Amino acid sequence: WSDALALGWPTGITPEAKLNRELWIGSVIASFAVGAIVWGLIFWTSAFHRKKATDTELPRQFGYNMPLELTLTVIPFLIISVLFYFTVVVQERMMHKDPNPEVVIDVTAFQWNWKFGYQKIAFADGSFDYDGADPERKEAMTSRPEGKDEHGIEKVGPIRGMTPEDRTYLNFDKIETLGTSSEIPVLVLPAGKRIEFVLNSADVIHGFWVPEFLFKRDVLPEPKANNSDNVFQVSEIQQTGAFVGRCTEMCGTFHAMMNFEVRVVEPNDFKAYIDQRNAGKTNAEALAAINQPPLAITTEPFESRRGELVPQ
Amino acid sequence: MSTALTHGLIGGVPLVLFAVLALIFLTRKGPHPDTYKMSDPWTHAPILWAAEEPREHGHGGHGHDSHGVVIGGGASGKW
Amino acid sequence: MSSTQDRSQLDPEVERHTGVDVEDVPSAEWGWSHMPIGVMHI
Amino acid sequence: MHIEARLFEILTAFFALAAVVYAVLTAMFATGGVEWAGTTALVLTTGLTLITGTFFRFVARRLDTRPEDYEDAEISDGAGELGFFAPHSWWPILISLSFSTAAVGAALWLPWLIAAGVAFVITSVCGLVFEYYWGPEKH
Amino acid sequence: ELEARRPFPERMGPKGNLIYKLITTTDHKLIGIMYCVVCFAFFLVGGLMALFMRTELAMPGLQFLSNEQFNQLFTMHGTVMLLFYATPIVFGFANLVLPLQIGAPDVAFPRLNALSFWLFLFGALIAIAGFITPGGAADFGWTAYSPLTDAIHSPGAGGDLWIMGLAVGGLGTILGGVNMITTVVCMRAPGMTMFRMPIFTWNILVTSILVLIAFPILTAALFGLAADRHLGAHIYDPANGGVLLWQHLFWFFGHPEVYIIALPFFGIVSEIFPVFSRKPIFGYTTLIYATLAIAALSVAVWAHHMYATGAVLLPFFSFMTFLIAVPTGIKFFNWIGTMWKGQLTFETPMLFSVGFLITFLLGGLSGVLLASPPLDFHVTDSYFVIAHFHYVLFGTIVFATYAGIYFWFPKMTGRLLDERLGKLHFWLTFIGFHTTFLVQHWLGDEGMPRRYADYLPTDGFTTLNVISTVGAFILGVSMLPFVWNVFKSWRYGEPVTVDDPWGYGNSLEWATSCPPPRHNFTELPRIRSERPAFELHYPHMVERMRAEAHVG
Amino acid sequence: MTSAVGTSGTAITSRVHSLNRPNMVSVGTIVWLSSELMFFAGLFAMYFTARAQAGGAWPPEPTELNLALAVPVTLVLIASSFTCQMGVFAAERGDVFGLRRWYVITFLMGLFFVLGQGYEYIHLVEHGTTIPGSAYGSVFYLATGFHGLHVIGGLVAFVLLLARTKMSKFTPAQATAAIVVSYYWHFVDIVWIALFATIYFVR
Amino acid sequence: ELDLPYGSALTSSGRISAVTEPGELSVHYPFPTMDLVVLDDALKYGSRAAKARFAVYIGPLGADTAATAREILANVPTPENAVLLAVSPDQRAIEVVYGADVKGRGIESAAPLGVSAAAASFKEGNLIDGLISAVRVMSAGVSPA
Ligand code: HEA
Ligand code: HEA
Ligand SMILES: CCCCCCCC/C=C\CCCCCCCC(=O)OC[C@H](COP(=O)(O)OCCN)OC(=O)CCCCCCCCCCCCCCC
Ligand SMILES: [Cu+2]
Ligand SMILES: [Cu+2]
Ligand SMILES: [Cu+2]
């Protein structure tokens, strides 16, 4: 009954997702109760037809019921305040910002596909002496001694002294699971660990949404400069297997072709995968080596052809 | 799924529903009074109809006065 | 009131008796005022 | 115009409260302090309502109760010379067309078309404004 | 002792009696008619864009549309339906009856409202004109987020025409707000106090303020975007707060935009219930306060459309989003109270008016679900949101506007729209609507972000999409009975030779000939209460309307 | 055409008798100015967001505001508002020519303000700062140049009203037209005061 | 003096503002809308040639039918050039009356033709069609003043 009453909400795979699903179930129950009573009122006042027995006498013509108005403007405030309190307590576990993530994934989303960096890994049980690279974060300070003019301008740069073509906000890592247009990226994560996602956009705003995480975030170009808390954490992922993930903000024309996967594997599988990726290998090769289907099993890199009626 | 089935569904379900609703509603007696049958007596109040065809001097009512009926003809018949 | 009512005698010459009427086109007598509907249809 | 002014006074009070609370709760408890977009927008919509309500209040204090604003007013009380309301005019469509020309000139970055559209807008606004003041031709 | 009336009223009129009025018309009644006709044309044009989206989305493949062609469709469909059908038609209805409903002969600046309509029409055309360009119309979404709208992304001319088309159309909306607000403040009947003018006129008044507060921000933002696109003005550069600046600027306009689209039709629905329930609008003084509260709150709860961005004071906007739902709840309960213990007769205006209640509520109930950020996270930017604001818009500005059209067609044409065709049109619309969008809640609840041109067959919810397409084509054919009804009822159809074709009318617009005389009146009754026309037509009720009032 | 069906001296008269009832044109123009305030609110929001995201040195190194020239123009605009109000006082009277003098010198001083703004613009442009050259330059130019466009529109309104006063007899309607034009000019100078305090003093 | 049974009130000026319950109509004429339109089209432009106002009176005309026809023709806006065809099916009677100005323009010669056209259709059983035919024939007969 819960699945049907959830209105097609996938059963979460994280503690945060489970808690959000429970809040959604409660809020939908409240909304359906309110809707049921209001629709009952409407379909019961629809029983007040103009009865032919109604002689030349108009209705009670009352209007203006102050006590009833007060009651029906007090109760909605109570309902929405209870819902707001539940919302706040659930929100509190939206980004706990635990300063000790078990694996940090640098999710950089460029125009029409994804890339995952594996910035850092630090298992609580003790493992994964791994770290991000960051030699490639090179700035584009246009601080030339002189510009077109002969002297004086000594232009530094448009924005904070730099150029919009900066890309310094982007972070890069040794293990990059770049997603090609013909190969859906598959970010592989260890099961049972705390996974942080550091979110960024190379070109334009778009949205990282794993539907089974019951949570999305908007990867913006420069979240730090836009006062956006791009980085967000997930306490745990219980269920293993492949979970589809999608782009949920306008990217451009190929906004519907940015699907990726978040394949949750066991911690030992993650050990093997990261070792085999440190060794020169691709994501598909590492998946095959850890004995898991290499290509995204929940989605395909569907046709680059503009459509069905195009003549190939 | 079943491209032909989906096309036929989207093209036909609206048509079937439209036909059903038209049969339900358009086939209902309208508020327009039924045509007066000659056999039945004339129950409606007297009806006088006029063309409004020509220009009536000035539009304003005042000044028209009552020159008179000045009847200038006649006729009769019994169907 | 700084205007004088105009009056004009326009030299007339079809007698606008089979075609358009002043009720439909107020200035039928003042110029070419009706094209046969056959012309528009064809 | 007491109620007319009071509407905007109430709106101004609410918008001032909203701007103040937004500014405070954004200067603290936000990622980067004051948002500076919502804050400014709220402050200047408070200013919108404040200007309109202040003018309406000035008018209400300057005016004796009108039949419109007076409960228990007979129609004959307000009966009289209503002011000039513009009859038929074809200048509005010309103004709209001129502004559309300027707008397409801005969209398609055509400075010549922008200049032409601005000149047409000036001409059409002049026509609309002078429509009921142009005197008879002097010959 | 008998009158010489024509056997039937004049059907159309003499050749060349209308074309020159349209060009020169300074009559609000005719301008309102121009709004309604033109606005509906954009509804049909904008609605047709959804049928192409529906047909494409019925199957996982890209059968006949391209990724960018589909992207242009929801941009222009969302744009046309909101800014070229929904926002211009509130001033279409305002121009239609607002001077009538306050006893005024005309609007405050009647050459200005003529300009507003033409600014709407021509501004709308240049926005839709992005289609004729080879690149296409504006590909970015209707919201038109910042970096995607920069010259770097979406460099085509269609995107620019869209920006300027809104600027031109926006000005007409701003000027229209000046007329309605100035008309109400200044031009009023000798007895119509501010607390006795009808609810619709009050709703338009507060809506006009929202228009003045909101639209200028859009024009400022659009010029900033246009400056960025044409001059590289770094106004919305992401390194600045550009991405969150535009969203803050746009939604500060955006959310009031979805309420100027809502409040006027709350008045229309509020105008129709008392006349057909045969009793006063339940809680008149409460509705005007509810309307005033909604407009005050709508300005300061703009950012609840930006929960996913993770860059806004999340608790603040959620609280006021829950606070702005309460006034709309009061308004909803009052409408039921008006229907309560009333001699309801479900003519085509009530039928649509009641339909608004049913559709709006479910859309409203989902609205608070979106007001919760934790729920808004998963469900944001998905078809659940598409289903939310369609149950609310379509409920509020299709069901209610049709109720307004059906309610006020005699009062502007002198002819009655056929009841049977109206009932057919409603149930086609009601059955069609609930079909297309009800499943879209489930569609988006499971992973399916909106603005998706294609989806995989392996992805589920393929059956829901076809069900949605079936509903939209039921909606597609539902506009045929309406257009036929209006087409054959404007020139033919049962004439009304009396005021109030719907007896028990209020608001003083039913105190004049159904086709109102130029300058709206030959007879202004003694205005005493919120129901002048009812007081006039039923003097015996005058005492009762005061006696039974207080009990509630 | 005996004398007239409408016993009015002027074919154009006030929209409602202003002595007892609100001046409708004044109400409309005040509301529209309240809207233009929100337009400038959007511009101010852009400027303040750029200022917030600036890394300490809000006006970049290349840009240097010429307050020595920005203060004279601001004082000239204030004087323009004062003389416009004097013109309004003439308008309330039948002083057609007093109104014309006051509004002509108002237009001249507003034109001087526009020319001074253009001078500062070209000076800043040749000294690096330009709309595409910097975020500061772009927000500053956007705000100040939209205000400059509003000032140009005000000058156009002034000359247009003067032309209208030249073609028909002075009446309460035309005095009201002058009053609303003055309302626009006062709004323009007030938004200029806000922009000056924001750009040059607050910085 | 009494207004309509319900909902109609005399206004500040002479005009009476009436109302009807939402379901029903106002004209209540017992003829199809389309043939009402046809008869209106006849009266309107099939008579423009005559330049004399053509009027139709379906109501009863009792007592001396001719005289009642005269004093109902009196109600036509300009009886001077007017042609009133009155049919009473309560009496199966037809009476056509003419104004002084509409005399000698073929109106007198068209009276038997119009009456016969009305009578044939009426005995066939079509009141509105007979009225239309009579109007057409009479208007063809009359010549502009
Ligand atoms: C007429 C148009 C209209 C109306 C009235 C509303 C009304 C409301 N909207 Fe609406 N909204 C839109 C049009 C509208 N909205 C549009 C067009 C979008 C764009 C989508 C996008 O771009 O994101 C949007 C987006 C939108 C979002 C963003 C969704 C997202 O992007 O993820 C959210 C919340 O997050 C929201 C909330 C609300 C709320 C809480 C109300 C409420 O104020 C009113 C409705 C709710 C009710 C509950 C009314 C019924 C109340 C009662 C019956 C009283 C008793 C019941 C209770 C107390 C629950 N709206
Ligand atoms: C007033 C506002 C309004 C209205 C009435 C509608 C009406 C409809 N909308 Fe609306 N819709 C929006 C506003 C509106 N929408 C907005 C604001 C968005 C978000 C856009 C964005 O995020 O960018 C949206 C998004 C949206 C989407 C998501 C697009 C995507 O993200 O991929 C879909 C998908 O099916 C959709 C479908 C529909 C349907 C089926 C209707 C139907 O109810 C429409 C009825 C159809 C018709 C009336 C056409 C039938 C008529 C004819 C076929 C005759 C044609 C004749 C001529 C052209 C002369 N809408
Ligand atoms: C909507 C308009 C379009 C979009 C919105 C624009 C709003 C701007 C408003 C006012 C700005 C005025 C001040 C502008 C001057 C300030 C100095 C400057 O801009 O810097 C020099 C740069 C070159 O820089 P460069 O190549 O790098 O070379 C450096 C050399 N070393 O010139 C420029 O591009 C500036 C040219 C901009 C002209 C804008 C004209 C607007 C008129 C539009 C008419 C109304 C349209 C109605 C629309 C419905
Ligand atoms: Cu995406
Ligand atoms: Cu993307
Ligand atoms: Cu909102």
Author numbering:
A (entry chain K): 27 to 338
B (entry chain a): 1 to 79
C (entry chain J): 1 to 13, 22 to 50
D (entry chain Z): 1 to 139
E (entry chain L): 10 to 561
F (entry chain X): 1 to 203
G (entry chain b): 13 to 157
Task: Please quote the paper that reports this structure.
In mycobacterial electron transport chains, CIII2CIV2 replaces canonical CIII and CIV, transferring electrons from the intermediate carrier menaquinol to the final acceptor, molecular oxygen, while simultaneously transferring protons across the inner membrane to power ATP synthesis. Structural analysis of the CIII2CIV2 supercomplex from M. smegmatis led to the discovery that a dimeric type C superoxide dismutase (SOD) is an integral component of the assembly.
CryoEM of the CIII2CIV2 preparation allowed for calculation of a 3D map of the enzyme at a nominal resolution of 3.0 Å. The map shows strong density for the LpqE subunit (orange). The overall resolution of the map, which is somewhat better than in previous studies, allowed refinement of an atomic model for CIII2CIV2 including residues T82, E83, A123 to D131, and S183 from LpqE, and residues H57 to G78 from MSMEG_4693 (also known as CtaJ), which could not be modeled previously. The N-terminal anchors from the SOD dimer that bind to subunit QcrB are well resolved and terminate at the middle of the complex with a lipid anchor (beige). In the inhibitor-free structure there is density for endogenous MQ in the QP site (pale blue surface). The naphthoquinone head group of MQ is positioned near the entrance to the site, between the F and C helices. In this position, the naphthoquinone head group is ~14 Å away from the FeS cluster and the hydroxyl proton is ~15 Å from His368, which is too far for rapid coupled electron and proton transfer from MQH2 to FeS and His368, respectively. Although the endogenous MQ found in the structure is most likely oxidized, the position it occupies is along the access path to the FeS center. This binding site within QP is denoted the Q1b position.
